[PDB]
Write a protein that binds this ligand. Structure first.
Ligand SMILES: FC(F)O[C@@H](Cl)C(F)(F)F
Ligand SMILES: FC(F)O[C@@H](Cl)C(F)(F)F
Lengths: 168, 168, 168, 168, 168
């Protein structure tokens, strides 16, 4: 590429992976959201929480794709694997699954930053710090807070309703 | 009738039945609503939910009557039977009764649409699709959602209060 | 499902397929859009055209998922295959690919409608007619119009720039 | 200096160089802009593009000078060499020259960041990341996009007019 | 001091103590607030209640310091001891600790007023009555009210969530 400068093939490849990870995460949150919209689950606030996260992850992928092009790298898309479950259990089960997923994304970001540091790619490092690293930390904190409140509330049926009504 | 075109006597008759069904449903919801206004039941949100549905069903009947005249059919009214119960039990009992009633109306709509299809009456089919079929599906979904939440909440007294307060 | 009425397993399954088709189409348009954002392609209007279509297809999938739940069917997600190309050639090549894709979606909608008709499922038929069938026809017409204008313009470089500048 | 803390003489010196580089770049863009204002060149949009870049580079130098003082370093100004050409040829020639110049500035920024990293000077690293690194990447991307469009348009006279009219 | 009139060394010294008491109380409420911000405690309303009290106590200290100077006394600051606990247990445990702390401050105010009365220092007495005595009484009443409601609510997990959601 005529514009490419200080952008390693290793980072370019890792950015394409991370795009796949973010799209997979978006797809997982789509499945989570619609599960809580089932007539036999029916927790609207939980559905909305996860549908909003699907949008956020999709937007993350799009930001990574924009940055890939800005640096002169080439987007390469792969098959998106379906989410790990078809049914997600209770709000607690779902929130546990979500925090596992976010920590997996956070670790991928951290690995990419480490790669960027090893390749002396300060633009990549700043890009990650500006748009992803703090967003992941804040989100993981919020999920941790939710998990604690859900757990405190488990008369499990009543607790799950009250959390959806009064927190989400 | 000078305006009547492609409107079978079978459909005309079935439209008069459906009007009776919708009026009966309106009357049932009137009884449900006022039961929840009793001083010894006293669930205002439940009362309002059912009184609003009484209005909606009445409006459905009126739309069917307007369409009957637009097509050149003749309204024929019959006795309206009283609702199936005088007392409706808990919110859960009442919501179960309501979903049974809505499914009965939905089936009558579907039968009428099938009749219209067999009689090649596209105006009837569109009329049903525009004003009734989707409205029934959405309402039945909402009642299903409510039933699930009520069931999750059954410390039955506390649950019933919380549902009325925080959902209805 | 407590709400399920007149909703065949065949339609439920076909709705899940169609969701996969719409998500695949969204992913294809994401790849198309970002290809035209490459520094060595650099056609902003083409990029925006396809990114908007990615959003529209995603929204279609979401509407199908909402309807699935409203009817008491169960969402089942599958792997999403990657788009058919990594690089999309010229605006003309891309628009040809897009119209092929839209016709494939349109045919899937038509097949689903035929299935609904055979299963006497008027709610499905109306749902498709209200939110998808006319939208597909209008979009395919617009792409046809674009294809004709692109073709007329092929001094191919100059033509492609002018189309992006003055139409897109 | 009474305020100086963790600010190496190597960085201070490199900041003075970079100021000279940014001022030289501002001067180059001044020459580019006024060349396109010649009555025998007469491409107003190209002139404006380069005059705006002259302002941006001057502002970059001023930000570096402000930071130098904030850290307790001492500005040292050197002769500013005249631009590499007196006449800049076509829009394409000029845009090629501009991207070469921007890549040279970007490399100087990257070298300075590497120096800051080796000297453990996190304030310098953040300063560069906040105000320069992303700005260079975005600008180089935009020039790459322009180069591609100019090249596609080369009936060279007609192409150059159309680019100036419809992009710049 | 040129302005000092009717201001005993005993009162001046006791005012410096009280400043230390108010600052210690501010520090205690800072620790309480951030404990309830822990991901494994996660009671936002409780955190906010205590952070607001930290601000109020700090402001009390500042008012005492302003009055000290107005009277011609001399501020003398001492080490601020860390709060009595690192972890504060439940909302109930924390509210009990808070009311103990407020009663300790109230007693210090009362002692200071008694000192002022014995020293015939009416300005001090009015100062205390205007800005502190009623504020302490109102706050202690509110905490008592909260303690009663928390106690009534102890299904301890559910109670603690509901108090935070619906009172704080
Ligand atoms: F197909 C993609 F563009 O969107 C993905 Cl994330 C999907 F999950 F919504 F399917
Ligand atoms: F003389 C400088 F202040 O401005 C430089 Cl940058 C010039 F290029 F405009 F001359």
């Amino acid at each position: 590429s005529q514009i490419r400068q200080n952008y390693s093939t290793e980072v370019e490849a890792a950015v394409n992976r991370l795009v796949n990870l973010y799209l997979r995460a978006s797809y997982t949150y789509l499945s989570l959201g619609f599960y809580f919209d089932r007539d036999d689950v029916a927790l609207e606030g939980v559905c909305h929480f996860f549908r909003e996260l699907a949008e956020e992850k999709r937007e993350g992928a799009e930001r990574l794709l924009k940055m890939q092009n800005q640096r002169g790298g080439r987007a390469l898309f792969q098959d998106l694997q379906k989410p790990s479950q078809d049914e997600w259990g209770t709000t607690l089960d779902a929130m546990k699954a979500a925090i596992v997923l976010e920590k997996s994304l956070n670790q991928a970001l951290l690995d990419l930053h480490a790669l960027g540091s090893a390749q002396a790619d300060p633009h990549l490092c700043d890009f990650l710090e500006s748009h992803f690293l703090d967003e992941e930390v804040k989100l993981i904190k919020k999920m941790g807070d939710h998990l604690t409140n859900i757990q405190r509330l488990v008369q499990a049926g009543l607790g799950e309703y009250l959390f959806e009504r009064l927190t989400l």
